[PDB]
Structure formats: C-alpha cells, structure tokens
Design a protein around this ligand. Structure first.
Ligand SMILES: C[C@@H]1CN(S(C)(=O)=O)CCN1Cc1cc2c(=O)n(C)cc(-c3ccn(C)n3)c2o1
Length: 125
C-alpha cells in the first residue's frame, strides 16, 4: 500500500478561535485519554504501509486520530468545541467501520468512547 496525506492541521482559509471549552478539550480531555492504556492505536494516523493494511484507506475515507486532534487543538485549528468533538466521534466510528464486533481494537475504542463521553459531560460552559 501507500499512505494518503494525513488530515490537515493547518489551513489559512479556515475560521478558528480559542474558547475555554477548546482549552479544556486539550488540557483535560485529550491529555487524559492519551494516557489510557488503550490509547496507543489512536495516537497517530493509521500507517497502512507499516501495518500491511492496503484496504484501510479503501474503507476509511474520513480518517481521524488523536495525534491529529492534539495538533489541531495546539495549532488553534478549530472554531468551536463541537468541531473537535466531531473529530473524536469520527475516530471511534472509523474503528467500528473497519474492524469487527468483538475485536480487541473495538473493545479498546469502546472503553475510550465511554471515557470520552463522561469527560464531555464534565465540559465547562
Ligand atoms: C493490528 C490490528 C489488530 N487488531 S486486534 C486483533 O487487536 O483487534 C485487529 C486489527 N488489526 C489492524 C488494525 C486496525 C487498526 C485501527 O483501526 N486503528 C485505529 C489502529 C490500528 C493500529 C495498529 C497498530 N497501531 C499503532 N495502530 C489498527 O490496526
């Protein structure tokens, strides 16, 4: 296989702003999820070359990962918290689309998704 370019983390055409919710999404939500023992499959874009997954980018056409999300938050890419939350959702959904119910990686995604929802419910207004 070959890898696609990773999702953009910079774009001068895009509106963006710093909000207190986006600051919390970096400092609390992302940085805590990152430390979970099940985070490692989700800390970078899927490297289809390294992993010998020539079908990954045939199935997943909107890739997303926490490495990309981290850089988007650090680089003030987002306009609001909802944009960032949608990237987390896309990441979890992709795992379920590409893998199978009952796979270890799916169990890992499910555990992180439940953690994420609890942390989103704890978002400041
Ligand atoms: C090897 C894994 C092993 N799993 S399993 C048996 O643990 O159930 C079945 C899928 N397979 C390929 C794969 C799918 C997939 C994925 O969706 N993400 C998000 C990340 C990885 C991965 C593998 C290693 N890294 C670093 N990331 C990843 O690898």
């Amino acid at each position: 296989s070959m890898n696609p370019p990773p999702p953009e983390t910079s774009n001068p055409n895009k509106p963006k702003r710093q909000t207190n919710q986006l600051q919390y999404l970096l400092r609390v939500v992302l940085k805590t999820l990152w430390k979970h023992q099940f985070a490692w499959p989700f800390q970078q874009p899927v490297d289809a070359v390294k992993l010998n997954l020539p079908d990954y980018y045939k199935i997943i056409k909107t890739p997303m990962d926490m490495g990309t999300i981290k850089k988007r938050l650090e680089n003030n890419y987002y306009w609001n918290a909802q944009e960032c939350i949608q990237d987390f959702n896309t990441m979890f959904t992709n795992c379920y689309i590409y893998n199978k119910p009952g796979d270890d990686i799916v169990l890992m995604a499910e555990a992180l998704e439940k953690l994420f929802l609890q942390k989103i419910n704890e978002l400041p207004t």
